[PDB]
Amino acid sequence: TRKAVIGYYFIPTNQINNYTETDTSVVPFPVSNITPAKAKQLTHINFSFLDINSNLECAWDPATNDAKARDVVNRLTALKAHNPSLRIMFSIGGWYYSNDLGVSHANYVNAVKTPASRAKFAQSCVRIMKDYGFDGVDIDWEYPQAAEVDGFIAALQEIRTLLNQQTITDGRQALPYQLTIAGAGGAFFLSRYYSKLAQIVAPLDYINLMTYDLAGPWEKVTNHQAALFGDAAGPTFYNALREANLGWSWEELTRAFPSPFSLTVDAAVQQHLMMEGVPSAKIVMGVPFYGRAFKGVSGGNGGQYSSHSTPGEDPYPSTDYWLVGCEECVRDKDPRIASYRQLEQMLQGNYGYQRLWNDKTKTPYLYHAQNGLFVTYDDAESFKYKAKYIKQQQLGGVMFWHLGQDNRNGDLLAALDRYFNAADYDDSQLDMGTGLRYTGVGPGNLPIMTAPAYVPGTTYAQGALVSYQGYVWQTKWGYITSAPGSDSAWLKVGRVA
Amino acid sequence: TRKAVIGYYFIPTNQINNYTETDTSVVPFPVSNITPAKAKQLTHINFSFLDINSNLECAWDPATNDAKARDVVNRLTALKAHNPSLRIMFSIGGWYYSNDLGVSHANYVNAVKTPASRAKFAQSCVRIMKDYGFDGVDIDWEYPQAAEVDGFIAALQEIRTLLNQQTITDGRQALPYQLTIAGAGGAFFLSRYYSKLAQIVAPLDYINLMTYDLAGPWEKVTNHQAALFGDAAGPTFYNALREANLGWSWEELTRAFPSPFSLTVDAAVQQHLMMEGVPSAKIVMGVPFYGRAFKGVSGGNGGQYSSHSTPGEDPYPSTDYWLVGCEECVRDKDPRIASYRQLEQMLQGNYGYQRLWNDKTKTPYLYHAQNGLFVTYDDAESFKYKAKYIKQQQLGGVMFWHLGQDNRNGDLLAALDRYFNAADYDDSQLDMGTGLRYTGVGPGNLPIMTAPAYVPGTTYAQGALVSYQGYVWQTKWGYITSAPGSDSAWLKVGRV
Numbered sequence: 005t006r007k008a009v010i011g012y013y014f015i016p017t018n019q020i021n022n023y024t025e026t027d028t029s030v031v032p033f034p035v036s037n038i039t040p041a042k043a044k045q046l047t048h049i050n051f052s053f054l055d056i057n058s059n060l061e062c063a064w065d066p067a068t069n070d071a072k073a074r075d076v077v078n079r080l081t082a083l084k085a086h087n088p089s090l091r092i093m094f095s096i097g098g099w100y101y102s103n104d105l106g107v108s109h110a111n112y113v114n115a116v117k118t119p120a121s122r123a124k125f126a127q128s129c130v131r132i133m134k135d136y137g138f139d140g141v142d143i144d145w146e147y148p149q150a151a152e153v154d155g156f157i158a159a160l161q162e163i164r165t166l167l168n169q170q171t172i173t174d175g176r177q178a179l180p181y182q183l184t185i186a187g188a189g190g191a192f193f194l195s196r197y198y199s200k201l202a203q204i205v206a207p208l209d210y211i212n213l214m215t216y217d218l219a220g221p222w223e224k225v226t227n228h229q230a231a232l233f234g235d236a237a238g239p240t241f242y243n244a245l246r247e248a249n250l251g252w253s254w255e256e257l258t259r260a261f262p263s264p265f266s267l268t269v270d271a272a273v274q275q276h277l278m279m280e281g282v283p284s285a286k287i288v289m290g291v292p293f294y295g296r297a298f299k300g301v302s303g304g305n306g307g308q309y310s311s312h313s314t315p316g317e318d319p320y321p322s323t324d325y326w327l328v329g330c331e332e333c334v335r336d337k338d339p340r341i342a343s344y345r346q347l348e349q350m351l352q353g354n355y356g357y358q359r360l361w362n363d364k365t366k367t368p369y370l371y372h373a374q375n376g377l378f379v380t381y382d383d384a385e386s387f388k389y390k391a392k393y394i395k396q397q398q399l400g401g402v403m404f405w406h407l408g409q410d411n412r413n414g415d416l417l418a419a420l421d422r423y424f425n426a427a428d429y430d431d432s433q434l435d436m437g438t439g440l441r442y443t444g445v446g447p448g449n450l451p452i453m454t455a456p457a458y459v460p461g462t463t464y465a466q467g468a469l470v471s472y473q474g475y476v477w478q479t480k481w482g483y484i485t486s487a488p489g490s491d492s493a494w495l496k497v498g499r500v501a
Numbered sequence: 502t503r504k505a506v507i508g509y510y511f512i513p514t515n516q517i518n519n520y521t522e523t524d525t526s527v528v529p530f531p532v533s534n535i536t537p538a539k540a541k542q543l544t545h546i547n548f549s550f551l552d553i554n555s556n557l558e559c560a561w562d563p564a565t566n567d568a569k570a571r572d573v574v575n576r577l578t579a580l581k582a583h584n585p586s587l588r589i590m591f592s593i594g595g596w597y598y599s600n601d602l603g604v605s606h607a608n609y610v611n612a613v614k615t616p617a618s619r620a621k622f623a624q625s626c627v628r629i630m631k632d633y634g635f636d637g638v639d640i641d642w643e644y645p646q647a648a649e650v651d652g653f654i655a656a657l658q659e660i661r662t663l664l665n666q667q668t669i670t671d672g673r674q675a676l677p678y679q680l681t682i683a684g685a686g687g688a689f690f691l692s693r694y695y696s697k698l699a700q701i702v703a704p705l706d707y708i709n710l711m712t713y714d715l716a717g718p719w720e721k722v723t724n725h726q727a728a729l730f731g732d733a734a735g736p737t738f739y740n741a742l743r744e745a746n747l748g749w750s751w752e753e754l755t756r757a758f759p760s761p762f763s764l765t766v767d768a769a770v771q772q773h774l775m776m777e778g779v780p781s782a783k784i785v786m787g788v789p790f791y792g793r794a795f796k797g798v799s800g801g802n803g804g805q806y807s808s809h810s811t812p813g814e815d816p817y818p819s820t821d822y823w824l825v826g827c828e829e830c831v832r833d834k835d836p837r838i839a840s841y842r843q844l845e846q847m848l849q850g851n852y853g854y855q856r857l858w859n860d861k862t863k864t865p866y867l868y869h870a871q872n873g874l875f876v877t878y879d880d881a882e883s884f885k886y887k888a889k890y891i892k893q894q895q896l897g898g899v900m901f902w903h904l905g906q907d908n909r910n911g912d913l914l915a916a917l918d919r920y921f922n923a924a925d926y927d928d929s930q931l932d933m934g935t936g937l938r939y940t941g942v943g944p945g946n947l948p949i950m951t952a953p954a955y956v957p958g959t960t961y962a963q964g965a966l967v968s969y970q971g972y973v974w975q976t977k978w979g980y981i982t983s984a985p986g987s988d989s990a991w992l993k994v995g996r997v
C-alpha cells in the first residue's frame with residue numbers, strides 16, 4: 005500500500021485576497037510552484053486553514069475574498085490532473101485558530117457539544133468540501149481535552165457518516181472522501197485525549213502526528229525538535245501520559261510511561277501504538293519542513309542542550325532579527341523559525357553556520373559558533389531514517405508543514421517520495437543507530453505469552469504466571485487466592501494466542 | 502466521646518454445647534470471667550462466631566445446641582446491668598468461615614449477590630439479633646473481593662436501614678443498634694475493597710481494623726505482628742494499594758502509596774484516612790491479646806528480622822509443640838500462637854525467655870536464646886502508644902481479639918480503659934518515638950493550603966499553585982492553559 009505523503013499548503017487570508025503567481029513579495033508560494041512532479045509526489049495536500057466560526061460551522065475567515073479563495077482551491081484541485089491519487093483536503097483550525105488561547109477556540113468546544121451542534125458542524129464541513137471542490141476534511145484542533153473529547157469523537161463519527169454518503173452520492177468510489185486530523189506528537193498535549201485514541205482514530209483515514217515542535221525557544225534547554233530516537237545526553241521530559249485518565253494501575257502506568265523520557269518521534273508513535281485499537285496504518289508521521297532557532301547558546305556540543313536567551317513569546321516580541329542571513333525571518337518578523345529553503349540558503353552563503361549531525365536522534369542542526377546560534381531542523385538525510393521507520397513500523401505515511409518551505413527544487417518532498425517509492429532507492433542497510441527507543445508497554449499492546457491456565461483454589465506465590473480469560477497474568481505478591489482480574493494482585497503481562 | 506473498647510468473646514461450638522462456668526478444662530473463658538469491672542471497661546463485646554449458611558442467611562453453626570447458645574448469649578447481655586453503654590454484638594464470619602478457601606466462603610459471595618439475596622440475608626441478621634438479644638451486627642468477611650464489593654456494600658446498607666428502623670421501633674435512641682465490620686489492617690487484603698472504603702464505612706458505626714497479624718510464620722522473615730510505627734531495619738512490603746482500582750493518576754498513586762513500605766498499624770490507619778469520606782471516628786484500631794511465635798530463628802537482633810523454620814500451614818501440621826512453657830499451645834495444638842495470658846506466665850516461669858522492646862515499633866517481643874524462639878505480641882506498654890495514637894488521630898477506639906487471652910486480672914483490657922478514661926493517667930509526654938510514619942497523602946488527608954484563585958485565561962508555569970473548587974492544585978508541567986480538574990496537568994495537592 006502506497007505511503008501517504010500529506011503536504012500542507014498554507015496561505016494566509018491576505019495572500020488569498022491578493023493572490024498572484026508572479027510576485028513572491030505578495031504570495032511567496034503560489035500554487036504554480038507545485039509542479040506536476042511535486043503533485044505526483046504527494047498523495048494529499050492539506051489546504052489550510054478554514055475555521056469554525058461563532059455560528060459553529062466550518063467557514064473561511066470572514067475576510068476572505070470568496071472568488072479568490074475558489075481560484076486558489078481550483079489551482080490545487082487542477083493538480084489532480086497530474087496524479088489520480090491526489091486529494092486536496094482542507095484543514096480546519098490549526099494552532100492559531102484552535103489552541104486554548106486561540107481566537108476561535110470556543111467555537112471548536114461549542115461546535116461539538118450536542119447532537120444538534122455536531123450535526124450542524126459536520127454538515128457544514130461536507131457542504132464546504134463540496135462547494136469548493138475539496139476531497140476530504142482534515143481537522144486540526146490543538147487540542148480537545150477533558151469533556152470535549154467525547155463530543156469531538158462524535159463530531160468525527162458524524163462527518164465520517166456524511167462523507168461516506170457523499171462518496172456514494174458523487175460516485176466517488178475510486179477516490180472516496182476522507183477524514184483526517186492533525187494529532188499531538190508530544191505527550192503533554194497528547195495526554196488530553198490519549199485515553200480515547202481508539203475512538204478518535206476509528207472514523208479517520210489517518211491521524212497525522214505533529215511529531216515535531218518537540219523543542220523550541222519556549223523550553224529552557226535547546227534540543228532537536230524532531231529527534232527520531234533519543235539522545236541520552238539531551239534533555240528528558242515528564243511523561244504526561246502517566247497522568248491521563250486511563251484507569252490503569254500503578255504498575256501498568258509505570259510499564260507504559262517511563263518518566264522522564266526522551267521526547268522523540270519514536271516515543272509519540274510508540275505511545276499511539278501502545279493503545280489498543282489504534283492501527284499503525286492510520287498513524288502518519290509528521291515532519292517539519294522548517295527549523296526552529298535559538299540564540300545565546302553555549303559552545304562545546306554544537307549548541308545542543310544549552311541554556312539560551314531566546315524569547316519564547318508569540319508573536320516575537322522584538323524587532324531584532326538575529327538569525328544571520330535569514331531573509332524570510334525578516335519577512336515573517338521572527339528569527340526563531342526558518343524554512344528548510346531558507347536554512348539551505350544560509351548554509352550556502354558564508355553566514356557562519358556549520359551543519360552538524362546527531363547520530364542518535366538522526367537529525368541535523370546548525371550551529372553558529374560566532375553568534376551563538378542553534379537551529380534544529382530536518383533534511384533529506386533525517387528523512388531517510390524517518391522513512392525507514394515509517395515502513396518498518398508499518399505507519400500510514402508522512403505529513404509535513406508546509407510545502408512553501410521546501411527548497412525551490414522541492415528536494416525534501418522528492419526525498420520522501422523517493423524513500424517510499426523509488427525502485428532505485430534501497431534503505432535495507434540503513435543503520436537506525438543506537439538512539440534511545442521508547443520502551444513502554446500498554447495493557448492494550450501486550451506481547452503474546454504462554455502460561456499454565458489459572459487453577460481456581462490455588463494459592464499463588466509472587467511472580468507466578470497464569471493464563472486466564474485471554475491474558476497471561478502475573479501476581480504482584482504472594483498467597484494469592486483470587487482469580488486473575490478479580491482483585492488487585494494480578495497484572496496482565498501478556499496476551500494468550 | 503468515649504473511645505470504643507471492643508472485645509471479642511469467642512466461643513467454639515463444642516464449648517457452647519458443653520458450656521460451664523466452673524471448669525476451665527471445658528470452657529477456658531466462660532462469661533463469668535467477664536466481671537462487673539471488665540464489663541464496665543468494655544463498650545462492646547463481639548460474640549463470635551455466627552456464619553452465613555447455604556440458605557444464605559446469617560445463622561449459628563448447625564451443630565450448635567440452641568438452648569445453650571441462648572444461655573451463653575443471655576449471660577453476656579446480662580452484663581449490661583453493669584454497664585449501660587455496653588453492647589453485645591454478634592460477629593458473622595471470621596477468618597476460618599469466610600476467607601477465600603474457608604468452609605463457608607461461597608455463602609458470603611452468594612448472599613450479597615442480588616437484591617433478593619441481600620434482602621434475605623439482611624433480614625436474617627436483624628432477626629438473629631432480635632431473637633438472641635444482641636445489640637448489633639458485626640460482619641467479619643475476610644474479605645470480599647473487588648467484584649463482590651458492591652454487593653457487600655449494598656448488603657451493609659440494607660442492614661443499616663433495617664437496624665435504624667429496629668432502633669426506632671424498640672425505642673433504642675439511647676443505645677442504637679449498631680453495624681460494624683472487621684476490616685483488613687494490612688494493604689494486601691485491604692486492596693480488595695480499598696477503592697470503595699467510603700461506601701463500605703458509610704453504613705457502619707465502626708470499621709474495626711485487624712491491625713495485627715502483620716507478621717507470622719507465613720512470612721520468611723520474623724517481624725512484629727502489630728508494629729505501631731516502622732523499623733527501617735525490619736522487612737518492608739509491596740504497597741498493594743497502588744494497584745487498587747482507584748482510577749488515580751500515577752502521581753496520586755505514588756504520593757499515596759510509597760512502596761515498599763513498613764506494614765504497621767500506623768500505615769493501615771493512615772491508608773484509611775487517605776480516603777475521602779472515611780471519618781477517623783469510625784476507624785477502630787485492632788490490637789491482638791495474643792502473640793505469634795517462630796522457631797529456628799537466629800540470634801543477633803533478639804530474633805527480630807530473622808529467617809526461621811516455623812511451619813506456615815494451618816492447622817499446625819505436627820505434634821511438636823516447641824513453644825517452651827506454652828501449655829495453652831498444647832491444649833490448642835499449635836505452638837505458633839500464644840495468648841498474652843500464657844506469654845506472661847511463660848515470662849515468669851523461667852523458661853528461658855527474655856522480654857525485649859523495640860522502641861521504633863513500640864512493641865515488645867520475647868526471645869528464647871537457648872532454643873531460638875521469637876514471639877511478637879502486645880502488652881500494656883505497647884498499648885500506651887497505641888492508645889495515645891488512637892487519641893491523637895481521633896480514631897473511634899480499640900478492638901481486640903480476644904477476651905479469653907487477657908490475663909486473669911484482665912490487665913490488658915484494664916490498661917486500654919485506663920489509657921482512654923483514667924483521670925489519673927497522663928500520657929501528654931509519652932514519647933511516640935522515631936519509628937517510621939506512613940507518609941502517603943491521598944484525597945481524604947490533603948494538607949490545608951492556600952493559593953491564589955485559579956484565573957481562566959491564564960497560562961501557568963510548572964509548579965504553579967492555585968485554588969479551585971476548594972482545593973489547591975499544582976501544575977505538573979508548564980504552559981498550562983486549562984483549568985484544574987479539566988486538565989490532567991494539575992495535581993490536587995491541598996484543600997481549602
Ligand SMILES: O=C1N[C@@H](Cc2ccc(O)cc2)C(=O)N2CCC[C@@H]12
Pocket residue numbers: 014053097098099100101319336337338341
Ligand atoms: O504567526 C505565525 N504563523 C506560522 C504559520 C502558521 C499559521 C497558522 C497556524 O495555525 C500555524 C502556523 C508561521 O510560519 N510564523 C512565522 C513567524 C510568525 C508565525
Ligand SMILES: O=C1N[C@@H](Cc2ccc(O)cc2)C(=O)N2CCC[C@@H]12
Pocket residue numbers: 012097098099100144146186214217341404405
Ligand atoms: O497547526 C499547525 N502548526 C504548524 C506548526 C507551527 C506552529 C506555530 C508556528 O508559528 C509555526 C509552525 C504545523 O506543523 N501544522 C501541521 C498541522 C497544522 C499546522
Ligand SMILES: O=C1N[C@@H](Cc2ccc(O)cc2)C(=O)N2CCC[C@@H]12
Pocket residue numbers: 164168171176177178180206207208209
Ligand atoms: O478506510 C476507510 N474507508 C471508509 C469506508 C468506505 C469504503 C469505500 C468507499 O467507497 C467509501 C467508504 C470508512 O468508513 N473509514 C473509517 C476510517 C477508515 C475509513
Ligand SMILES: O=C1N[C@@H](Cc2ccc(O)cc2)C(=O)N2CCC[C@@H]12
Pocket residue numbers: 463483485596600602714717719813815
Ligand atoms: O495463616 C495465615 N496466613 C496469612 C497469609 C495467607 C492468606 C491466605 C491464605 O489462604 C494463606 C495464607 C494470613 O493472611 N492470615 C490471616 C489469619 C491467618 C493468617
Ligand SMILES: O=C1N[C@@H](Cc2ccc(O)cc2)C(=O)N2CCC[C@@H]12
Pocket residue numbers: 550594595596597598816833834835838
Ligand atoms: O484454628 C485456630 N483458630 C484460632 C481462633 C479463631 C477461630 C475462628 C476465626 O475465624 C479466627 C480465629 C486460634 O486461636 N487458634 C489456636 C491454634 C489453632 C488456631
Ligand SMILES: O=C1N[C@@H](Cc2ccc(O)cc2)C(=O)N2CCC[C@@H]12
Pocket residue numbers: 509594595596597641643683711714838901902
Ligand atoms: O477473624 C478473626 N481472626 C482473629 C485473628 C486470628 C486468625 C487466625 C488464628 O488462627 C488466630 C487468630 C482476629 O483477630 N479476629 C478479629 C476479627 C475476627 C477474628
Ligand SMILES: O=C1N[C@@H](Cc2ccc(O)cc2)C(=O)N2CCC[C@@H]12
Pocket residue numbers: 099103105217220222316318960980982
Ligand atoms: O510557541 C509555541 N509554544 C509552545 C508552548 C506553548 C503552549 C501553549 C501556549 O499557550 C503557549 C506556549 C507550543 O506548544 N507551541 C505549539 C506551536 C507554537 C509553539
